[PDB]
Amino acid sequence: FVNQHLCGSHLVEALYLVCGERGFFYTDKAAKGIVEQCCTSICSLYQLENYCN
Amino acid sequence: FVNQHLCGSHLVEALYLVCGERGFFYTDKAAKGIVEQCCTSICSLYQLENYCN
Amino acid sequence: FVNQHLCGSHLVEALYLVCGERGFFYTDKAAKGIVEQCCTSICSLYQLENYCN
Amino acid sequence: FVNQHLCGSHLVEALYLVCGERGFFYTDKAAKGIVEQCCTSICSLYQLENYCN
Amino acid sequence: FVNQHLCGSHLVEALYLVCGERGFFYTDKAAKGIVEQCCTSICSLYQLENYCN
Amino acid sequence: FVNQHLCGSHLVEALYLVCGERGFFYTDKAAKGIVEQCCTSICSLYQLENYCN
Ligand SMILES: Cc1cccc(O)c1
Ligand SMILES: Cc1cccc(O)c1
Ligand SMILES: Cc1cccc(O)c1
Ligand SMILES: Cc1cccc(O)c1
Ligand SMILES: Cc1cccc(O)c1
Ligand SMILES: Cc1cccc(O)c1
Ligand SMILES: Cc1cccc(O)c1
Ligand SMILES: Cc1cccc(O)c1
Ligand SMILES: [Cl-]
Ligand SMILES: [Cl-]
Ligand SMILES: [Zn+2]
Ligand SMILES: [Zn+2]
C-alpha cells in the first residue's frame, strides 16, 4: 500500500495553510513523526500547529 | 490577487515529491527565492531540488 | 474569470480543513463574498473560519 | 477516520467542479450521506450532481 | 492573470475526473489547444468531455 | 473501495509535473500497469518519466 505517501501529500498542504509566514520544516527527522501520528488518526488544527516553525 | 499564495501552494506539493527522503524547510523568508524564481518561470525538477534538505 | 475559478478551487479545500466537523455551505452567495474577500488579498484563518457553519 | 477525511477532501474538489455556480452544502449533516455513498464505492459525476444546490 | 502552468495542472485533474477509464489520445496540438481555450475562458465539464477518447 | 481512484488522481498530478510540456500518453494497458505498480509501492519520479512523451 501507498497510504502514508498519499497522506504526506495532504499533510504538507495543511502545514502550508496552518503555518502561514512562520513556515515549517518537513525534514526526515521530525517529519516521520507527524506522519506516524497524523496519518494514523486525524490530527486537529492545533496538533498540526505544533509542527510549525 | 493572491498570486504568491496560489503559486506557493503548488510549490510545496512539488517539493514534497522531488525532495522525497531529503525533505525541505519552507520558511517564508527562505520561500522568497523559490517563489520569485519559480512563480515567474517554469522551474525544472533539477532546479526545484536545489531547495531540498 | 478563470483566475477566480482556480482560486475558488483552493478556497473549497481550505474551508474543508478549517471548518472541521462543522462543515460549510458554498452556496452561490457565500461563494461570491469569500471569493471577493479572499482571492483579492490573503485571508487569515480567523477570516476563513467566519464562513464555516 | 483519516481515510474518510482523505476521501472527503477529494470529494469537495469534485463537487466544486460539478456543481458550478449552483454550489453545494457540505455541513456535517449535509455531507455524511455523501461520504457514506461515495467513499465506500466510486460515484460518477451524474450521481455527484444530486448533491448540488 | 492566469499562470498557464498552474492552470494546466487543474485541467489535467479535471480530465482524469471527466474521462476516467475512457482516457484520451494525446497530440501536441490538442494539448496546447485545451490549455489555450480553458485557461482564458472557463470551460465546463461538457466542453472537457470532448477531449476524452 | 475508492483507494485506487484516489491514488490515480495523485499519479496524474505527479506525471503532469514530471513530464512538463512533453505531456504523457494513455493506453488501457499502461494505465492498468502504473496503478498496479505505483499504488502498491512508491514509484520514483525516474520511473514515472517513462510515461512522458
Ligand atoms: C489535515 C490532515 C491531513 C492529513 C491527515 C490529518 O490527520 C490531518
Ligand atoms: C508550481 C510549480 C511547479 C514546478 C515548477 C514551477 O516553476 C512551479
Ligand atoms: C486559496 C486561499 C487559501 C487560503 C487563503 C486565501 O485568502 C485564499
Ligand atoms: C470524484 C470522487 C472523489 C472521491 C470519491 C468519489 O466517489 C468520487
Ligand atoms: C488525464 C487522464 C489520465 C488518466 C486517465 C484519464 O481519463 C485522463
Ligand atoms: C475544470 C477547469 C480547470 C481549469 C480551467 C478550466 O477552464 C476548467
Ligand atoms: C492531457 C495532458 C495535457 C496536458 C499535459 C499533460 O501532461 C497531459
Ligand atoms: C509520486 C507518486 C504518487 C502516487 C504514487 C506513487 O507510487 C508515487
Ligand atoms: Cl488520498
Ligand atoms: Cl492555481
Ligand atoms: Zn489524496
Ligand atoms: Zn492551483
CSV table of C-alpha atoms and ligand atoms in Angstrom, one decimal:
chain,number,residue,atom,x,y,z
A,1,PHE,CA,0.0,0.0,0.0
A,2,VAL,CA,0.9,3.6,-0.5
A,3,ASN,CA,-1.2,5.2,2.3
A,4,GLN,CA,1.3,7.2,4.2
A,5,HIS,CA,2.9,8.8,1.0
A,6,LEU,CA,-0.7,9.8,0.0
A,7,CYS,CA,-1.3,11.1,3.5
A,8,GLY,CA,2.1,13.1,3.4
A,9,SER,CA,0.9,14.9,0.4
A,10,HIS,CA,-2.2,16.3,2.1
A,11,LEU,CA,-0.4,17.0,5.4
A,12,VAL,CA,2.1,19.4,3.7
A,13,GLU,CA,-0.7,21.3,2.1
A,14,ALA,CA,-2.3,21.5,5.6
A,15,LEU,CA,1.0,22.8,7.1
A,16,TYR,CA,1.3,25.4,4.4
A,17,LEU,CA,-2.1,26.7,5.2
A,18,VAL,CA,-1.9,26.4,9.0
A,19,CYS,CA,1.7,27.6,9.4
A,20,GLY,CA,1.5,30.8,7.3
A,21,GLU,CA,4.5,33.1,7.1
A,22,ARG,CA,6.1,31.1,10.0
A,23,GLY,CA,6.5,28.1,7.7
A,24,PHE,CA,7.6,24.6,8.7
A,25,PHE,CA,10.4,22.1,8.3
A,26,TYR,CA,9.4,18.8,6.7
A,27,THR,CA,12.7,17.1,7.2
A,28,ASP,CA,13.3,13.3,7.8
A,29,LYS,CA,13.9,14.0,11.5
A,30,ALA,CA,10.6,15.1,12.9
A,31,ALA,CA,8.6,14.6,9.7
A,32,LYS,CA,8.4,10.8,10.0
A,33,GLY,CA,6.9,11.7,13.4
A,34,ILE,CA,4.0,13.8,12.1
A,35,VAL,CA,3.2,11.0,9.7
A,36,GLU,CA,3.4,8.4,12.4
A,37,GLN,CA,0.8,10.4,14.4
A,38,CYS,CA,-1.4,12.3,11.9
A,39,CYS,CA,-1.7,9.6,9.2
A,40,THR,CA,-2.7,7.0,11.9
A,41,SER,CA,-5.6,9.1,13.3
A,42,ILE,CA,-6.9,12.5,12.4
A,43,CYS,CA,-5.0,15.4,13.7
A,44,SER,CA,-6.7,18.7,14.7
A,45,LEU,CA,-5.5,22.2,13.5
A,46,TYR,CA,-3.9,22.7,16.9
A,47,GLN,CA,-2.0,19.4,16.8
A,48,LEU,CA,-0.8,20.4,13.3
A,49,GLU,CA,0.4,23.8,14.7
A,50,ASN,CA,3.0,22.1,17.0
A,51,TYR,CA,5.0,21.2,13.8
A,52,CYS,CA,5.1,24.8,12.7
A,53,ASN,CA,8.2,26.9,13.0
B,1,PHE,CA,-4.8,38.8,-6.2
B,2,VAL,CA,-3.2,36.1,-4.0
B,3,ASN,CA,-0.7,35.2,-6.8
B,4,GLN,CA,2.0,34.3,-4.3
B,5,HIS,CA,-0.2,32.0,-2.1
B,6,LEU,CA,-1.6,30.0,-5.0
B,7,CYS,CA,1.8,29.5,-6.6
B,8,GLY,CA,3.3,28.7,-3.1
B,9,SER,CA,0.6,26.1,-2.6
B,10,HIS,CA,1.7,24.1,-5.7
B,11,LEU,CA,5.4,24.6,-4.9
B,12,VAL,CA,5.1,22.8,-1.5
B,13,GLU,CA,3.5,19.8,-3.2
B,14,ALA,CA,6.2,19.8,-6.0
B,15,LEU,CA,8.9,19.9,-3.2
B,16,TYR,CA,7.3,17.0,-1.3
B,17,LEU,CA,7.6,14.9,-4.3
B,18,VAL,CA,11.0,15.9,-5.7
B,19,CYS,CA,12.8,16.0,-2.3
B,20,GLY,CA,11.4,12.6,-1.1
B,21,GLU,CA,13.6,11.5,1.8
B,22,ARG,CA,15.8,14.7,1.9
B,23,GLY,CA,12.6,16.7,3.0
B,24,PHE,CA,12.9,20.5,2.9
B,25,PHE,CA,12.3,23.6,5.0
B,26,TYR,CA,9.7,26.2,3.8
B,27,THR,CA,10.3,29.5,5.5
B,28,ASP,CA,8.5,32.4,4.1
B,29,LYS,CA,11.9,34.1,4.3
B,30,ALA,CA,13.5,31.1,2.6
B,31,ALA,CA,10.5,30.7,0.4
B,32,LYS,CA,11.2,34.1,-1.3
B,33,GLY,CA,13.9,32.8,-3.6
B,34,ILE,CA,11.9,29.8,-4.9
B,35,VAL,CA,8.7,31.9,-5.4
B,36,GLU,CA,10.5,34.7,-7.1
B,37,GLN,CA,12.2,32.3,-9.4
B,38,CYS,CA,9.5,29.6,-10.0
B,39,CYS,CA,6.4,31.6,-10.0
B,40,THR,CA,7.7,33.8,-12.8
B,41,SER,CA,9.1,31.0,-14.9
B,42,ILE,CA,8.7,27.2,-15.0
B,43,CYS,CA,11.4,25.6,-12.9
B,44,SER,CA,12.9,22.3,-13.9
B,45,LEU,CA,12.8,19.5,-11.4
B,46,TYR,CA,16.5,19.8,-11.1
B,47,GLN,CA,16.0,23.5,-10.2
B,48,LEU,CA,13.5,22.6,-7.6
B,49,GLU,CA,15.9,20.0,-6.0
B,50,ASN,CA,18.2,22.9,-5.2
B,51,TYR,CA,15.8,23.8,-2.4
B,52,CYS,CA,15.7,20.3,-0.8
B,53,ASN,CA,17.3,19.5,2.5
C,1,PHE,CA,-13.0,34.6,-14.7
C,2,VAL,CA,-10.5,31.7,-14.8
C,3,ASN,CA,-8.2,33.1,-12.1
C,4,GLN,CA,-11.3,33.3,-9.7
C,5,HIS,CA,-12.3,29.8,-10.7
C,6,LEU,CA,-8.9,28.5,-9.7
C,7,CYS,CA,-8.7,30.5,-6.5
C,8,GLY,CA,-12.1,29.2,-5.5
C,9,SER,CA,-10.9,25.6,-6.1
C,10,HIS,CA,-8.2,26.2,-3.4
C,11,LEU,CA,-10.7,28.0,-1.1
C,12,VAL,CA,-13.1,25.0,-1.0
C,13,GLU,CA,-10.1,22.9,0.3
C,14,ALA,CA,-9.0,25.3,2.9
C,15,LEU,CA,-12.6,25.6,4.2
C,16,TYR,CA,-12.8,21.8,4.3
C,17,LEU,CA,-9.8,21.8,6.5
C,18,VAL,CA,-10.5,24.8,8.8
C,19,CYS,CA,-14.2,24.0,9.3
C,20,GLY,CA,-13.5,20.5,10.7
C,21,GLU,CA,-16.6,18.5,11.6
C,22,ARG,CA,-18.9,21.6,11.4
C,23,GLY,CA,-18.6,21.9,7.6
C,24,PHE,CA,-19.7,24.8,5.4
C,25,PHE,CA,-22.1,25.8,2.7
C,26,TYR,CA,-20.7,27.0,-0.6
C,27,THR,CA,-23.9,28.4,-1.9
C,28,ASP,CA,-23.6,31.0,-4.7
C,29,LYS,CA,-23.8,33.8,-2.2
C,30,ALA,CA,-21.3,32.8,0.3
C,31,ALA,CA,-19.0,31.9,-2.6
C,32,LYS,CA,-19.2,35.4,-4.1
C,33,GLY,CA,-18.2,37.1,-0.9
C,34,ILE,CA,-15.4,34.7,0.1
C,35,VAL,CA,-14.1,35.0,-3.4
C,36,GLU,CA,-14.0,38.8,-3.3
C,37,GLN,CA,-12.6,38.9,0.1
C,38,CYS,CA,-10.0,36.2,0.0
C,39,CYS,CA,-8.9,35.9,-3.6
C,40,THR,CA,-8.2,39.7,-3.8
C,41,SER,CA,-5.8,39.6,-0.9
C,42,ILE,CA,-4.9,36.9,1.6
C,43,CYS,CA,-7.3,35.9,4.4
C,44,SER,CA,-6.1,34.8,7.8
C,45,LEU,CA,-7.5,31.6,9.3
C,46,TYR,CA,-9.9,33.7,11.5
C,47,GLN,CA,-11.4,35.2,8.4
C,48,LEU,CA,-11.9,31.9,6.8
C,49,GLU,CA,-13.3,30.4,10.0
C,50,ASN,CA,-16.1,33.0,9.7
C,51,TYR,CA,-17.5,31.3,6.6
C,52,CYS,CA,-17.8,28.0,8.4
C,53,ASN,CA,-21.0,26.6,9.9
D,1,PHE,CA,-11.1,8.1,10.3
D,2,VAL,CA,-8.1,9.6,8.4
D,3,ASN,CA,-9.2,7.6,5.2
D,4,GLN,CA,-12.7,9.2,5.0
D,5,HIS,CA,-11.1,12.6,5.8
D,6,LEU,CA,-8.7,12.0,2.8
D,7,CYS,CA,-11.6,11.0,0.6
D,8,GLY,CA,-13.8,14.0,1.6
D,9,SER,CA,-11.0,16.3,0.5
D,10,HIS,CA,-11.1,14.9,-3.0
D,11,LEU,CA,-15.0,14.9,-3.0
D,12,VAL,CA,-15.1,18.6,-2.2
D,13,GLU,CA,-12.9,19.3,-5.1
D,14,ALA,CA,-15.3,17.2,-7.4
D,15,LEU,CA,-18.4,18.9,-6.1
D,16,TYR,CA,-16.9,22.3,-6.7
D,17,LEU,CA,-16.4,21.4,-10.4
D,18,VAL,CA,-19.6,19.5,-10.9
D,19,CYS,CA,-22.0,21.9,-9.2
D,20,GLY,CA,-20.7,25.1,-10.8
D,21,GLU,CA,-22.3,28.3,-9.9
D,22,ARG,CA,-25.0,26.3,-8.1
D,23,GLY,CA,-22.6,25.4,-5.3
D,24,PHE,CA,-23.4,22.9,-2.7
D,25,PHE,CA,-23.8,22.3,1.1
D,26,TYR,CA,-21.0,20.5,2.9
D,27,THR,CA,-22.1,20.8,6.5
D,28,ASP,CA,-21.8,17.8,8.9
D,29,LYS,CA,-25.5,16.9,8.2
D,30,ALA,CA,-25.3,17.5,4.6
D,31,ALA,CA,-22.1,15.7,3.9
D,32,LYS,CA,-22.1,12.4,5.7
D,33,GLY,CA,-24.9,10.9,3.4
D,34,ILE,CA,-22.3,11.8,0.6
D,35,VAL,CA,-19.4,10.2,2.3
D,36,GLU,CA,-21.4,7.1,3.1
D,37,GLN,CA,-22.3,6.6,-0.6
D,38,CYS,CA,-19.2,8.0,-2.3
D,39,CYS,CA,-16.2,7.0,-0.1
D,40,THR,CA,-17.0,3.2,0.0
D,41,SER,CA,-17.9,3.0,-3.7
D,42,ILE,CA,-16.9,5.3,-6.6
D,43,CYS,CA,-19.6,7.8,-7.6
D,44,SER,CA,-19.9,9.1,-11.2
D,45,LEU,CA,-20.3,12.8,-11.9
D,46,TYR,CA,-24.0,12.3,-12.6
D,47,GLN,CA,-24.5,10.8,-9.1
D,48,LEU,CA,-22.4,13.7,-7.5
D,49,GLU,CA,-24.6,16.2,-9.1
D,50,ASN,CA,-27.6,15.1,-7.0
D,51,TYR,CA,-25.7,16.8,-4.2
D,52,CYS,CA,-25.6,20.4,-5.8
D,53,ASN,CA,-27.8,23.2,-4.5
E,1,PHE,CA,-3.9,37.0,-14.8
E,2,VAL,CA,-3.6,33.2,-15.2
E,3,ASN,CA,-0.4,31.3,-14.8
E,4,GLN,CA,-0.8,28.7,-17.6
E,5,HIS,CA,1.3,26.1,-15.9
E,6,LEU,CA,-0.7,26.2,-12.8
E,7,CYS,CA,-4.0,26.3,-14.7
E,8,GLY,CA,-2.8,23.1,-16.7
E,9,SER,CA,-2.4,21.2,-13.5
E,10,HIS,CA,-6.1,21.7,-12.6
E,11,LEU,CA,-7.1,20.9,-16.1
E,12,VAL,CA,-5.3,17.5,-16.1
E,13,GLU,CA,-7.0,16.7,-12.9
E,14,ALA,CA,-10.5,17.6,-14.3
E,15,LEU,CA,-9.9,15.5,-17.4
E,16,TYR,CA,-9.0,12.5,-15.1
E,17,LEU,CA,-12.4,13.3,-13.5
E,18,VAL,CA,-14.4,13.5,-16.6
E,19,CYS,CA,-12.8,10.9,-18.8
E,20,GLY,CA,-11.7,8.3,-16.3
E,21,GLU,CA,-11.2,4.9,-17.9
E,22,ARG,CA,-12.1,6.2,-21.4
E,23,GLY,CA,-8.7,8.2,-21.3
E,24,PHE,CA,-7.7,10.4,-24.2
E,25,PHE,CA,-5.5,10.4,-27.4
E,26,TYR,CA,-2.5,12.7,-26.7
E,27,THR,CA,-1.3,15.1,-29.5
E,28,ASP,CA,0.7,18.3,-29.0
E,29,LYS,CA,-2.0,20.3,-30.9
E,30,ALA,CA,-4.9,19.2,-28.7
E,31,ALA,CA,-2.8,19.7,-25.6
E,32,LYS,CA,-1.9,23.2,-26.5
E,33,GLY,CA,-5.5,23.8,-27.7
E,34,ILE,CA,-7.1,22.9,-24.4
E,35,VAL,CA,-4.7,24.9,-22.3
E,36,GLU,CA,-5.2,27.9,-24.6
E,37,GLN,CA,-9.0,27.8,-24.5
E,38,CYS,CA,-9.8,26.7,-20.9
E,39,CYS,CA,-7.0,28.9,-19.3
E,40,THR,CA,-8.5,32.0,-20.8
E,41,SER,CA,-12.3,31.3,-20.6
E,42,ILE,CA,-13.8,28.9,-18.1
E,43,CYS,CA,-14.5,25.5,-19.6
E,44,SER,CA,-17.5,23.5,-18.5
E,45,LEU,CA,-17.3,19.7,-17.9
E,46,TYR,CA,-19.3,19.2,-21.1
E,47,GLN,CA,-16.6,21.1,-23.1
E,48,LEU,CA,-13.9,18.9,-21.5
E,49,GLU,CA,-15.6,15.6,-22.3
E,50,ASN,CA,-15.0,16.4,-26.0
E,51,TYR,CA,-11.3,15.5,-25.5
E,52,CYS,CA,-12.0,12.1,-24.0
E,53,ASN,CA,-11.5,9.1,-26.1
F,1,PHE,CA,-13.1,0.8,-2.2
F,2,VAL,CA,-12.2,4.2,-3.7
F,3,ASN,CA,-8.5,3.9,-2.8
F,4,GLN,CA,-7.1,3.2,-6.3
F,5,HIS,CA,-9.2,6.1,-7.9
F,6,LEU,CA,-7.6,8.3,-5.2
F,7,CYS,CA,-4.0,7.1,-5.7
F,8,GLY,CA,-4.6,7.5,-9.6
F,9,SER,CA,-5.5,11.3,-9.0
F,10,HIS,CA,-2.3,11.8,-7.3
F,11,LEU,CA,-0.3,10.0,-10.0
F,12,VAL,CA,-1.9,12.2,-12.6
F,13,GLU,CA,-0.6,15.3,-10.7
F,14,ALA,CA,2.9,13.7,-10.5
F,15,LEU,CA,3.0,12.8,-14.2
F,16,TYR,CA,1.9,16.4,-15.1
F,17,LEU,CA,4.8,17.7,-13.1
F,18,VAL,CA,7.5,15.3,-14.1
F,19,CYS,CA,6.6,15.4,-17.8
F,20,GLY,CA,6.0,19.1,-18.2
F,21,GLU,CA,5.5,20.3,-21.7
F,22,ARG,CA,6.2,16.8,-23.2
F,23,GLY,CA,2.9,15.6,-21.8
F,24,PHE,CA,2.2,11.9,-21.3
F,25,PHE,CA,0.4,9.2,-23.4
F,26,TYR,CA,-2.5,6.9,-22.4
F,27,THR,CA,-3.2,3.4,-23.3
F,28,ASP,CA,-5.6,0.9,-21.4
F,29,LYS,CA,-2.7,-1.3,-20.6
F,30,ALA,CA,-0.3,1.3,-19.2
F,31,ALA,CA,-3.0,3.0,-17.2
F,32,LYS,CA,-3.7,-0.5,-15.6
F,33,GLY,CA,0.0,-1.0,-15.1
F,34,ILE,CA,1.1,2.2,-13.3
F,35,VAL,CA,-1.8,1.8,-10.9
F,36,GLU,CA,-1.0,-1.8,-10.1
F,37,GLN,CA,2.7,-0.9,-9.6
F,38,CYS,CA,2.6,2.7,-8.2
F,39,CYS,CA,-0.4,2.2,-5.9
F,40,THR,CA,1.3,-0.9,-4.3
F,41,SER,CA,4.7,0.6,-3.6
F,42,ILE,CA,6.2,4.1,-4.0
F,43,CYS,CA,7.4,4.8,-7.5
F,44,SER,CA,10.2,7.2,-8.0
F,45,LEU,CA,10.0,10.3,-10.4
F,46,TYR,CA,12.6,8.5,-12.6
F,47,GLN,CA,10.2,5.6,-13.0
F,48,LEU,CA,7.3,7.9,-13.9
F,49,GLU,CA,9.4,9.7,-16.5
F,50,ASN,CA,9.0,6.6,-18.7
F,51,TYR,CA,5.4,7.5,-19.5
F,52,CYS,CA,6.1,11.0,-20.7
F,53,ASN,CA,6.2,11.6,-24.4
G,1,LIG,C1,-5.4,17.9,7.8
G,1,LIG,C2,-4.9,16.5,7.8
G,1,LIG,C3,-4.4,15.9,6.7
G,1,LIG,C4,-3.9,14.6,6.7
G,1,LIG,C5,-4.0,14.0,8.0
G,1,LIG,C6,-4.5,14.6,9.1
G,1,LIG,O1,-4.7,13.9,10.4
G,1,LIG,C7,-5.0,15.8,9.1
G,2,LIG,C1,4.1,25.2,-9.2
G,2,LIG,C2,5.5,24.8,-9.9
G,2,LIG,C3,5.9,23.5,-10.2
G,2,LIG,C4,7.0,23.2,-10.9
G,2,LIG,C5,7.8,24.3,-11.5
G,2,LIG,C6,7.3,25.6,-11.2
G,2,LIG,O1,8.0,26.7,-11.7
G,2,LIG,C7,6.1,25.9,-10.5
G,3,LIG,C1,-7.0,29.9,-1.6
G,3,LIG,C2,-6.8,30.8,-0.4
G,3,LIG,C3,-6.4,30.0,0.7
G,3,LIG,C4,-6.3,30.5,1.9
G,3,LIG,C5,-6.5,32.0,1.9
G,3,LIG,C6,-6.8,32.7,0.8
G,3,LIG,O1,-7.1,34.2,1.0
G,3,LIG,C7,-7.0,32.2,-0.5
G,4,LIG,C1,-14.7,12.0,-7.7
G,4,LIG,C2,-14.7,11.3,-6.4
G,4,LIG,C3,-13.9,11.7,-5.3
G,4,LIG,C4,-13.9,10.9,-4.2
G,4,LIG,C5,-14.9,9.9,-4.0
G,4,LIG,C6,-15.7,9.5,-5.2
G,4,LIG,O1,-16.6,8.5,-5.2
G,4,LIG,C7,-15.6,10.2,-6.3
G,5,LIG,C1,-5.5,12.9,-17.6
G,5,LIG,C2,-6.0,11.4,-17.5
G,5,LIG,C3,-5.3,10.4,-17.0
G,5,LIG,C4,-5.7,9.0,-16.9
G,5,LIG,C5,-7.0,8.9,-17.4
G,5,LIG,C6,-7.7,9.9,-17.9
G,5,LIG,O1,-9.0,9.9,-18.4
G,5,LIG,C7,-7.3,11.3,-18.0
G,6,LIG,C1,-12.0,22.4,-14.8
G,6,LIG,C2,-11.2,23.5,-15.2
G,6,LIG,C3,-9.8,23.6,-14.8
G,6,LIG,C4,-9.1,24.6,-15.4
G,6,LIG,C5,-9.6,25.6,-16.2
G,6,LIG,C6,-10.9,25.4,-16.6
G,6,LIG,O1,-11.4,26.3,-17.6
G,6,LIG,C7,-11.7,24.4,-16.2
G,7,LIG,C1,-3.7,15.5,-21.4
G,7,LIG,C2,-2.4,16.2,-20.9
G,7,LIG,C3,-2.5,17.6,-21.1
G,7,LIG,C4,-1.5,18.5,-20.8
G,7,LIG,C5,-0.4,18.0,-20.1
G,7,LIG,C6,-0.3,16.6,-19.9
G,7,LIG,O1,0.9,16.3,-19.2
G,7,LIG,C7,-1.3,15.8,-20.3
G,8,LIG,C1,4.5,10.3,-6.8
G,8,LIG,C2,3.6,9.1,-6.5
G,8,LIG,C3,2.3,9.3,-6.4
G,8,LIG,C4,1.4,8.3,-6.1
G,8,LIG,C5,2.0,7.0,-6.1
G,8,LIG,C6,3.4,6.8,-6.2
G,8,LIG,O1,3.8,5.5,-6.1
G,8,LIG,C7,4.3,7.8,-6.4
G,9,CL,CL,-5.6,10.4,-0.9
G,10,CL,CL,-3.7,27.9,-9.1
G,11,ZN,ZN,-5.4,12.4,-1.8
G,12,ZN,ZN,-4.0,25.9,-8.1
